[PDB]
Design a protein around this ligand. Structure first.
Ligand SMILES: CNC(=O)c1c(-c2ccc(F)cc2)oc2cc(N(CCO)S(C)(=O)=O)c(C3CC3)cc12
Ligand SMILES: C[C@@H](O)C[C@H]1OC[C@@H](C2CCCCC2)N(c2cc(C#CC(C)(C)C)sc2C(=O)O)C1=O
Length: 564
């Protein structure tokens, strides 16, 4: 069937969409080539509709059936509870899209009778009706990028498909406990999202180095959500039903699957019927968990079909990395073609064909790669990095324009050990927060696609927990990493190292003088900037942070909230 059918009505905006970086001194102190920065709009939505629209001709085999049987047996070792209306309400982000029925995210979060009574009636409707398609809104995402006139044209906007706020709260009541516990039980060490960034890089290095002769590859499916079939979504539901669940949860999961997850009508911001979806909705609670289970199921079966030796997989939704024992260069090339053919039959063809890699640092997945540096004690440290262009372009945009859910803070958290996050992002944003007396103001940001409320003052403790103490003292960055950052500085017109060092020395002196958490920021984050370095020891308060509920993936809806 077609992933989408369209009526011809347009995907419309709900507000004015800015496309350019405004004239701003604080943003210009970050990058001067402002004309290179753009934001996508609904005007390019038809280019994205074309890319995501295609027929799926899925064929399953014994390898797929065998893997599915193993996954179902492991899902039967899970027990999940229904969340109460109150518990699901508190998981709703403060800027979550308002309901069409006269209440918003604030009303849901503060348990207003109007919001709570509406959610309870949406719940009873899911129990009583297991067939009627649930409405969804289709919107074009406005995201910021830097122009790249090598691969020509600017990026078209991404699309987001989501049901009403009332339905979203119900999805949490039925499935939040499932999506946050089931993948670890079914896929064990292969479940990518459960690892912190520091644990992820350590796992990757140890999985790689444990092989006699390693070969690895990233497998990037072209338009994963569109490749997901009605049968894939019903198989995902059969896995959920293997859990030990309450009767109402079983009924609500069956109803959400048939009415929402398998497909439904698409409505624009104007209330016009845009078409029909027969694939994964990008903005549903199960998007991340469903994509992970489906991608794992297809990949594990394709590993068997390809006869890859000692397949070790890391799965984060649609992002897949396979590490195996090499059988020789020609044999590995043949095995990869067989893997791709198997994935293609299962309705997961690649964007670009995978290439076998024999150097861990040359694999890219989730836009990231493993790089190496040394710490204050001279110890070799592996860490994850990425090209800094998109993070810096977004950082300049978010400096000049208010953004309710920022990217710079999540980027500092996820990429804390990196040369670019340390030299630029931390220096720039601590300078502004200090000057504006906003160090204590908690900000909404995203980590693994879910929303977090974080106070910038807690960054040293968060960084220590997620990356380790070494994150505050890395030196001897690789030449490849130095070049990638220097190229970005040249391209975007960012000030050089000497300028960031001067700014960081000034920021550090002011933070230290404030004492308390601000002094920890100055001491740890900016120890690189001073000649006479302070001794960095484990921060006692770091173990106080409750991170037990962290790392539940929210892509692409981002409709999960946690306050630190
Ligand atoms: C299957 N792919 C993966 O597991 C990931 C790889 C990867 C794996 C193998 C390899 F050879 C090179 C890179 O790098 C990552 C970076 C992030 N992060 C950034 C998310 O934007 S992070 C640095 O916070 O950990 C995440 C976050 C989404 C969970 C996942 C991955
Ligand atoms: C403060 C400085 O004069 C001293 C010293 O601090 C330690 C590190 C850095 C600093 C910035 C913040 C993170 C640690 N460092 C560094 C900077 C690099 C670079 C670059 C380009 C892209 C600008 C050309 S390469 C590198 C390394 O150690 O290999 C330094 O040179």
């Amino acid at each position: 069937s077609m992933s989408y059918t369209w009526t011809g009505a347009l995907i419309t905006p709900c507000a004015a969409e800015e496309t350019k970086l405004p004239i701003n001194a604080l943003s210009n102190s970050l990058l001067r080539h402002h004309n290179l920065v753009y934001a996508t709009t609904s005007r390019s939505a038809s280019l994205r509709q074309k890319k995501v629209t295609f027929d799926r001709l899925q064929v399953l085999d014994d390898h797929y059936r065998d893997v599915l049987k193993e996954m179902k047996a492991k899902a039967s070792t899970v027990k999940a509870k229904l969340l109460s209306v109150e518990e699901a309400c508190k998981l709703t982000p403060p800027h979550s899209a308002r309901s069409k029925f006269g209440y918003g995210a604030k009303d849901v979060r503060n348990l207003s009778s109007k919001a709570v009574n509406h959610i309870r009636s949406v719940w009873k409707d899911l129990l009583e009706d297991t067939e009627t398609p649930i409405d969804t809104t289709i919107m074009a995402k406005n995201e910021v990028f830097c122009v790249q006139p090598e691969k020509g044209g600017r990026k078209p906007a991404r699309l987001i498909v989501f049901p009403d706020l009332g339905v979203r709260v119900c999805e949490k009541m039925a499935l939040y406990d499932v999506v946050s516990t089931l993948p670890q039980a079914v896929m064990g060490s292969s479940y990518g999202f459960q690892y912190s960034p520091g644990q992820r890089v350590e796992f990757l290095v140890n999985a790689w180095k444990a092989k006699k002769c390693p070969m690895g590859f990233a497998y990037d499916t072209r338009c994963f959500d569109s490749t997901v079939t009605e049968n894939d979504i019903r198989v995902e539901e059969s896995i959920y039903q293997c859990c030990d669940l309450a009767p109402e949860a079983r009924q609500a999961i069956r109803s959400l699957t048939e009415r929402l997850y398998i497909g439904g009508p698409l409505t624009n911001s104007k209330g016009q019927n845009c078409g029909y979806r027969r694939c994964r909705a990008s903005g549903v609670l199960t998007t991340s968990c469903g994509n992970t289970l489906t991608c794992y199921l297809k990949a594990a079966a394709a590993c068997r079909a390809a006869k890859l030796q000692d397949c070790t997989m890391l799965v984060c939704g649609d992002d897949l990395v396979v590490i195996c024992e090499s059988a020789g260069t020609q044999e590995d090339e043949a095995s990869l073609r067989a893997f791709t053919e198997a994935m293609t039959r299962y309705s997961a063809p690649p964007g670009d064909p995978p290439k076998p890699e024999y150097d861990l640092e040359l694999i890219t997945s989730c836009s990231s790669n493993v790089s190496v540096a040394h710490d204050a004690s001279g110890k070799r440290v592996y860490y994850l990095t990425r090209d800094p262009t998109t993070p810096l372009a977004r950082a300049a945009w978010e400096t000049a324009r208010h953004t309710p859910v920022n990217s710079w803070l999540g980027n500092i958290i996820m990429y804390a050990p990196t040369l670019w996050a340390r030299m630029i992002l931390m220096t720039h944003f601590f300078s502004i927060l200090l000057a504006q007396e906003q160090l204590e103001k908690a900000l909404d940001c995203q980590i693994y696609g879910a929303c977090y409320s974080i106070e910038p003052l807690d960054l040293p403790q968060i960084i220590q927990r997620l990356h380790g103490l070494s994150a505050f003292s890395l030196h001897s960055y690789s030449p490849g990493e130095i070049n990638r950052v220097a190229s970005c500085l040249r391209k975007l017109g960012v000030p050089p190292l000497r300028v960031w060092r001067h700014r960081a020395r000034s920021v550090r002196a002011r933070l230290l003088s404030q004492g308390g958490r601000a002094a920890t920021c100055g001491k740890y984050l900016f120890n690189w900037a001073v000649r006479t370095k302070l001794k960095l020891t484990p921060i006692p308060a770091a173990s106080q942070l409750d991170l037990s509920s962290w790392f539940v993936a929210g892509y692409s809806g981002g409709d999960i909230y946690h306050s630190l």
